[PDB]
Design a binder for this molecule. Structure first.
Ligand code: DRF
Lengths: 258, 260
């Protein structure tokens, strides 16, 4: 039923808004777009960093490393947002808690690199709630171990953004990724898929009404997950090698592995 | 529900791909399910489940079994190749782009075709005449016993979709005409052809499996499993390259494997 799918969308979008501070609109204004009225601190040098870090304020402060530990803080911060969001997806709370937890522990990575793309352009990604901007070439130029961490995220986002999806389209697409269903260790895989399908239908009507002129956008968007999985896979890989570099107590704890 | 000149051309594409499909690959899935379900015994499969069996299966090791899979795939590449030529637009693209799509597409497809030759217990071999068991394979010399396992895992969740050849023919095409492949020169032309193949598929499903809701989405996601599989395969494949040096990989499979 058209209306049903339409309201499921308004609801989810409404949730996307209260769960996520930096919406993609609010982030395009600030980014490559003019708007904003007053741009963010740009970090392109080892010196702009010290200045931005010392002036742009910061939470994760106690080079190539301090940056990594930077993502981590924001990620661990993201995950909390995504999770409070998942809890609004109709019927998510009603699933087996063991399942719910497995859906997050597994889909939280893709919902990040998905939303990261909203804060990206070919030359860099917004930082600190958009109050900053770290150039892309600065990042790829970091110490040997850390110069490939964010590069493949750029390569993806450049493609993902190709679809020019807005918030309301991403709110649904995101739901669809959480109510995955093929995550290892799931107990009652049925109600999950039962909801995803109810999410997938809403994505369709949504992507059809919001991008009528975009041919087979639904198909194209679904195949981007084949790209997210590869990022998250290739990512967790590097994330292993970093342990053959870093090798704390109460911190190493707060950052299990996100 | 209804019709329209729009859908019409697609259907004709659905039928064109299906025809060239049946024409390109000898062993379809239909003939595959026939053999596998011992319900139809107009001609049944010999079974290999241990060395003893394997030994007698020549009446009509872990290495030679390997040079078997290897050989089959060279022929499967050929079949997929010829099938590609028949894909509307493909032979019109830059000769290079063609070589690229065939490059990063042959396996993601060979593992699709492979699922229609499988079932939890085993897989068909030698045109469907034989049937090797998961167990036996999963018990070959230390390294060679991990090759096929991940295939079965996939074939299992894949076949779950319940797709028949007229569906695979379109999806098998949607795979070649990718566009997000490494080393492509002109892309939008490649993208355009596919956005069409996709249109065909989305219809061929909503029509051939009416009751199967969101089969279009469920199936596109399965493409992830294929990359992973190709990944894992190449690395295990990398190992046999250094441990077994007296052994030889096939030039074709060799030239097709040179990137991520
Ligand atoms: C080692 C070769 O790896 C190939 C890929 C590949 C792997 C498995 C395949 O399934 C083949 C199934 N099969 C088979 C399985 C086990 C032993 C022998 C044997 O021979 C035949 C003969 C006819 C049909 C099917 C088979 C295909 C390609 C490659 O990397 O390119």
């Amino acid at each position: 039923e058209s209306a049903d799918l339409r309201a499921l969308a308004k609801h989810l979008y409404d949730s996307y808004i209260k769960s996520f501070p930096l919406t993609k609109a609010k982030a395009r204004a600030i980014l490559t777009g003019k708007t904003t009225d007053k741009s963010p601190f740009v970090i392109y040098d080892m010196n702009s960093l010290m200045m931005g870090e010392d002036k742009i304020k910061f939470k994760h402060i106690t080079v190539a490393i301090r940056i990594f530990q930077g993502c981590q803080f924001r990620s661990v911060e993201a995950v909390q947002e995504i999770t409070e969001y998942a809890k609004s997806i109709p019927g998510f709370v009603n699933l087996d808690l063991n399942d719910q937890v497995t859906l997050l522990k597994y889909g939280v990575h893709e919902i990040i690199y998905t939303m990261l793309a909203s804060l990206m352009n070919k030359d860099g990604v917004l930082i600190s709630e958009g109050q900053g901007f770290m150039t892309r070439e600065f990042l790829k130029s970091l110490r040997k171990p850390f110069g490939d961490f964010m590069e493949p995220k750029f390569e993806f986002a450049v493609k993902f953004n190709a679809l020019e999806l807005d918030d309301s389209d991403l709110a649904i697409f995101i739901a669809v990724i959480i109510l995955s269903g093929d995550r290892p260790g799931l107990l009652n895989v049925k109600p999950i898929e039962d909801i995803q399908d109810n999410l997938l239908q809403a994505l369709e009507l949504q992507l059809k009404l919001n991008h009528p002129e975009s041919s087979q956008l639904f198909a194209k968007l679904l195949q981007k997950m084949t790209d997210l999985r590869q990022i998250v896979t290739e990512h967790v890989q590097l994330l292993q090698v970093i342990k053959k570099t870093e090798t704390h107590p109460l911190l190493q704890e707060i950052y299990k592995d996100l």
